[PDB]
């Protein structure tokens with residue numbers, strides 16, 4: 001399925017080249033511009049564990065997830081991955097635990113040492 005395909009065929013987008021964050025572009029977005037550090041970014045996402053269990057979806061809440069990019073407001077894989085996206089882009093992101101919740105996890109849904117899969121759609125970005 002999609003998690004196997006990004007694991008086996010994804011692009012390593014880490015600066016370290018450590019395979020910690022892998023990406024496949026699923027829907028090509030608009031033009032060339034990507035968001036910059038400090039931009040307010042609006043996204044929709046769904047996330048799943050390596051055991052196949054869904055853990056969250058913004059679509060199910062009928063509102064986007066909003067954060068400021070590159071400020072450590074989200075897990076490392078998301079600051080790294082969203083920074084690569086064009087407006088309107090949908091991608092798949094595989095996140096090894098060192099770029100996600102590590103050995104701690106996030107109770108109750110995320111266990112220790114968890115590799116995470118996300119589908120992410122970048123809706124918009126703007127400077128404040």
Ligand SMILES: CC[C@@H]1CCCC[C@@]1(O)C(=O)C(=O)N1CCCC[C@H]1C(=O)O[C@H](CCc1ccc(OC)c(OC)c1)c1cccc(OCC(=O)O)c1
Pocket residue numbers: 045047055056057065066067072073074075076078100101106109110
């Ligand atoms: C079950 C996983 C998780 C549980 C908390 C709510 C969100 C959650 O359901 C989830 O799907 C998730 O795993 N997210 C939410 C969408 C962005 C990616 C990821 C996330 O980063 O959530 C953070 C969790 C807290 C956090 C922030 C920064 C960290 O490192 C710098 C970090 O490391 C372990 C952990 C989150 C949750 C809620 C809001 C967030 O930012 C916007 C805001 O603060 O209003 C961010």
